[PDB]
Amino acid sequence: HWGYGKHNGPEHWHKDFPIAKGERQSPVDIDTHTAKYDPSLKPLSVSYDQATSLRILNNGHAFNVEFDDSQDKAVLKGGPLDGTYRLIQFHFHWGSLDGQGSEHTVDKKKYAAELHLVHWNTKYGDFGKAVQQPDGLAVLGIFLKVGSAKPGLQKVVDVLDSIKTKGKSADFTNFDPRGLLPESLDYWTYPGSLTTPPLLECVTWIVLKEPISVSSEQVLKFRKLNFNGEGEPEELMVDNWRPAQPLKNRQIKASFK
Numbered sequence: 001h002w003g004y005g006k007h008n009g010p011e012h013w014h015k016d017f018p019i020a021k022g023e024r025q026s027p028v029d030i031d032t033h034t035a036k037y038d039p040s041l042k043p044l045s046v047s048y049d050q051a052t053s054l055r056i057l058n059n060g061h062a063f064n065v066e067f068d069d070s071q072d073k074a075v076l077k078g079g080p081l082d083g084t085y086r087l088i089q090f091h092f093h094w095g096s097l098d099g100q101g102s103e104h105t106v107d108k109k110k111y112a113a114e115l116h117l118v119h120w121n122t123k124y125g126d127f128g129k130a131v132q133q134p135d136g137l138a139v140l141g142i143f144l145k146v147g148s149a150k151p152g153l154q155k156v157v158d159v160l161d162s163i164k165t166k167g168k169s170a171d172f173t174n175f176d177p178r179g180l181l182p183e184s185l186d187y188w189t190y191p192g193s194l195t196t197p198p199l200l201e202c203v204t205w206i207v208l209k210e211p212i213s214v215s216s217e218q219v220l221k222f223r224k225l226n227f228n229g230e231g232e233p234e235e236l237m238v239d240n241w242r243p244a245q246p247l248k249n250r251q252i253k254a255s256f257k
């Protein structure tokens with residue numbers, strides 16, 4: 001099965017998922033001088049006031065905080081998107097060291113981690129249909145740098161002891177994802193893919209310019225999770241990021257100068 005090790009990591013994925021070598025793969029390096037400011041880009045509309053978090057799950061590759069997506073409760077609109085996209089889950093990718101962990105890079109700079117708020121286009125009816133469409137998902141990507149703590153992340157950090165190993169889940173209600181957002185919603189955007197298998201080319205990526213700061217203790221607690229299931233040999237869940245992929249025939253657009 002695929003993963004992030006020496007024998008099943010990102011350089012192996014194409015053998016089971018040939019789209020790994022496709023034309024719109026993610027993540028990418030964001031060359032800030034080559035991105036083009038698009039003044040027609042609209043401000044992002046993040047409407048998370050009615051969000052209903054349900055549960056947090058260790059799936060063996062990351063942890064997902066899952067939301068009720070059966071109504072328009074937490075939606076992303078505007079920006080480059082047409083229509084309404086519903087929040088289904090968020091998760092992170094992170095490193096073994098503070099100098100690495102993000103999937104996207106900014107002028108080759110790697111951040112300590114990257115948050116992915118995953119949304120699907122309501123015109124396709126459900127997430128499974130949406131991932132089969134070139135405009136099916138919108139993933140809002142937010143970089144994490146190590147510095148001051150992020151208070152809105154702490155409820156996530158504190159529950160991780162309950163989901164240490166693959167397949168463990170915990171109730172996780174009343175979590176407000178607005179506590180994970182930076183001040184500015186300035187963003188870069190480009191067409192891309194899921195960054196884990198099945199690597200489907202269904203994502204409008206929206207990557208925020210401004211990182212959030214989290215404390216060293218917060219990211220340390222991410223690194224105590226396990227890729228393995230309970231009663232299996234312990235592999236720390238670290239470096240669960242795919243490196244930057246070729247940009248090919250794509251232009252990254254910026255909502256700001």
Ligand SMILES: NS(=O)(=O)c1ccc(O)c(NC(=O)NCCCCO)c1
Pocket residue numbers: 059061116118139193194195196197198199203
């Ligand atoms: N990193 S991402 O581009 O924001 C991303 C957003 C939504 C996704 O569905 C995936 N891929 C995925 O879930 N693959 C199957 C493993 C889960 C079952 O345990 C990746």
Ligand SMILES: [Zn+2]
Pocket residue numbers: 091092093116195
């Ligand atoms: Zn992700």
